[PDB]
Amino acid sequence: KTVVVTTILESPYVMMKKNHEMLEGNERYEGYCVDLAAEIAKHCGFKYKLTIVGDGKYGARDADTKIWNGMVGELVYGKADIAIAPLTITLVREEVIDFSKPFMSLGISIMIKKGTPIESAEDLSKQTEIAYGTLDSGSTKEFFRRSKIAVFDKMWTYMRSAEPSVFVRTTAEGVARVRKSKGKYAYLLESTMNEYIEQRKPCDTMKVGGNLDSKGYGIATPKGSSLGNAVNLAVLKLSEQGLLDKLKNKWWYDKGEC
Amino acid sequence: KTVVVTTILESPYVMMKKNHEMLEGNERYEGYCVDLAAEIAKHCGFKYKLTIVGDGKYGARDADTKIWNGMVGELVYGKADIAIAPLTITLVREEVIDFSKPFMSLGISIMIKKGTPIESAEDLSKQTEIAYGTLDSGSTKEFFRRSKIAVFDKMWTYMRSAEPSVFVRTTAEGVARVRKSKGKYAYLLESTMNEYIEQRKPCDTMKVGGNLDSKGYGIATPKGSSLGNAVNLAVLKLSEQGLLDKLKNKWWYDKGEC
Numbered sequence: 001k002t003v004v005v006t007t008i009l010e011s012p013y014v015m016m017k018k019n020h021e022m023l024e025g026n027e028r029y030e031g032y033c034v035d036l037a038a039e040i041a042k043h044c045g046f047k048y049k050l051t052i053v054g055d056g057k058y059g060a061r062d063a064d065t066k067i068w069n070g071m072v073g074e075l076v077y078g079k080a081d082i083a084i085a086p087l088t089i090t091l092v093r094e095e096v097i098d099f100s101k102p103f104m105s106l107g108i109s110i111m112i113k114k115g116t117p118i119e120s121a122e123d124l125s126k127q128t129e130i131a132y133g134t135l136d137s138g139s140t141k142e143f144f145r146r147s148k149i150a151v152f153d154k155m156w157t158y159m160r161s162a163e164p165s166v167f168v169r170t171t172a173e174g175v176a177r178v179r180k181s182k183g184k185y186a187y188l189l190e191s192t193m194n195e196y197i198e199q200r201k202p203c204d205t206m207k208v209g210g211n212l213d214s215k216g217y218g219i220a221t222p223k224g225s226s227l228g229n230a231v232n233l234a235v236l237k238l239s240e241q242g243l244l245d246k247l248k249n250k251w252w253y254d255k256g257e258c
Numbered sequence: 259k260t261v262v263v264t265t266i267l268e269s270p271y272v273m274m275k276k277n278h279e280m281l282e283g284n285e286r287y288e289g290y291c292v293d294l295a296a297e298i299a300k301h302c303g304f305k306y307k308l309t310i311v312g313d314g315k316y317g318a319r320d321a322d323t324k325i326w327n328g329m330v331g332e333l334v335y336g337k338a339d340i341a342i343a344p345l346t347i348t349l350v351r352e353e354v355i356d357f358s359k360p361f362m363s364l365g366i367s368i369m370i371k372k373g374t375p376i377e378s379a380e381d382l383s384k385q386t387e388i389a390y391g392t393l394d395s396g397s398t399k400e401f402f403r404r405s406k407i408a409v410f411d412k413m414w415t416y417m418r419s420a421e422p423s424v425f426v427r428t429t430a431e432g433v434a435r436v437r438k439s440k441g442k443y444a445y446l447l448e449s450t451m452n453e454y455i456e457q458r459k460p461c462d463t464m465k466v467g468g469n470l471d472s473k474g475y476g477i478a479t480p481k482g483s484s485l486g487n488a489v490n491l492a493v494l495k496l497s498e499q500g501l502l503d504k505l506k507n508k509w510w511y512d513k514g515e516c
């Protein structure tokens with residue numbers, strides 16, 4: 001049987017290739033997670049089809065219906081067999097799906113347009129001129145929603161009520177908002193994506209401050225899946241081979257333009 | 259049943275209190291892992307007893323006898339229920355014990371005496387004047403033994419045949435050797451321990467270069483243990499609440515001496 005893999009279009013994890021129109025199936029895509037999927041499948045010995053998550057989301061639980069959306073939902077409701085994406089290992093997700101040991105470390109970070117007078121999260125929290133937000137239906141938004149840290153709690157109070165809305169539907173929308181806003185919008189996103197974007201033309205954004213937290217991405221499977229054990233061992237093996245480091249260099253710094 | 263916890267005397271994870279001979283049971287010890295153990299136990303709702311691993315080792319499998327030593331062995335052979343220590347998540351260990359998601363990120367790093375003319379592993383590998391080694395029966399030694407990367411295998415070829423032995427039995431032994439060798443010994447050890455020592459008097463050592471790899475410490479349980487699930491959720495909860503960050507600040511930097 002062919003394993004259905006859910007993933008998400010997010011650079012440089014999964015991107016449409018330049019010449020995709022004349023390519024078919026898995027071939028249409030390239031990126032870190034596309035390379036990772038291929039080695040996972042080889043080591044675990046399965047065939048697979050990459051599918052882009054229908055609703056374009058990572059995954060959160062609707063507070064009223066309790067229904068999961070995004071890639072998490074696809075796993076939970078049996079629409080996909082595995083998710084290979086920059087999907088953050090969190091407590092609420094671990095309660096409903098299984099994660100491999102992390103294949104990448106990261107933390108929440110701040111993206112500004114170059115020249116913006118912001119140096120830290122505390123800086124953002126102490127002013128009103130510069131608006132800031134995060135991605136909808138992701139782990140970053142939940143981080144701020146839940147934080148008991150005075151700075152982050154204060155930021156959340158501001159974000160949850162801001163007008164117009166400071167939240168975005170995709171990372172691309174967030175980055176575009178930063179770029180178009182003349183330094184009046186800052187974007188809270190994962191350090192991995194931040195570091196990638198900082199090295200791509202037009203080279204007008206910057207990661208500022210340290211990471212706000214430390215966590216990891218994992219490969220996710222439905223709870224009790226026959227795949228979970230093999231996938232976990234494969235991640236550890238690839239880590240120890242140095243393959244994960246190699247892929248990181250290939251997609252982040254070999255592809256730098258600035 | 260009172261949960262038997264195996265750990266290791268390694269600063270600042272587990273250290274004897276000043277007045278330990280007048281104290282009883284868990285109260286004899288202090289440190290990052292002693293603090294973390296108390297929190298894990300409270301969140302999972304179990305009573306526990308801290309015990310120091312008899313052989314003072316982390317854990318490796320003897321190639322001849324095939325017997326696991328150290329903390330790993332305590333779990334494999336049923337002498338302890340859980341290990342709470344700076345125990346690295348590795349593939350060969352994961353094949354015989356279970357790990358939680360990591361509670362700390364780290365990588366192999368280089369410790370030099372200040373002023374030593376070394377900036378990288380590449381530097382080390384290309385010279386002979388300065389000796390270098392690692393801890394016995396640990397994940398760092400196995401990293402070099404198993405590596406297929408040219409620089410690291412060149413280093414392994416040197417270390418395995420160096421005389422006198424460049425390997426040490428404890429982290430403290432390694433650090434003392436650096437401090438006493440007038441710049442002629444460099445020590446390969448995890449960035450966490452390197453960072454801690456750098457902040458301790460006499461303030462004569464330094465971490466140089468980037469990390470050689472990226473991995474994590476996990477809380478370990480015997481394979482298939484019923485504690486595994488609860489412990490993993492507790493680590494993720496404490497991570498998200500920021501407890502782990504607070505503990506690292508407390509034991510590394512708040513106490514800094516340099």
Ligand SMILES: NC(=O)CN1CCCC1=O
Nearest residue numbers: 103104239244245248472
């Ligand atoms: N982004 C990364 O390189 C993650 N890696 C690399 C090696 C091991 C690991 O967890």
Ligand SMILES: NC(=O)CN1CCCC1=O
Nearest residue numbers: 210211212213214503507
């Ligand atoms: N208080 C902290 O040090 C928080 N940090 C810094 C780096 C990563 C992380 O979680």
Ligand SMILES: NC(=O)CN1CCCC1=O
Nearest residue numbers: 102215216360361362363
């Ligand atoms: N290793 C991870 O993916 C996340 N981390 C890093 C340190 C502590 C933690 O929970």
Ligand SMILES: NC(=O)CN1CCCC1=O
Nearest residue numbers: 245365468469470471472
């Ligand atoms: N090729 C690399 O970037 C290797 N590194 C650097 C830091 C951590 C790690 O595994």
Ligand SMILES: N[C@@H](CCC(=O)O)C(=O)O
Nearest residue numbers: 058086087088138139140
């Ligand atoms: N990696 C995140 C998405 C990006 C973000 O929330 O900043 C997740 O799994 O939800």
Ligand SMILES: N[C@@H](CCC(=O)O)C(=O)O
Nearest residue numbers: 316344345346396397398
């Ligand atoms: N954390 C390591 C010990 C220290 C080292 O090997 O550098 C282990 O679990 O083996």
Ligand SMILES: [Zn+2]
Nearest residue numbers: 016019020021
């Ligand atoms: Zn097209």
Ligand SMILES: [Zn+2]
Nearest residue numbers: 039042043243
């Ligand atoms: Zn491979």
Ligand SMILES: [Zn+2]
Nearest residue numbers: 062063064065
């Ligand atoms: Zn709703």
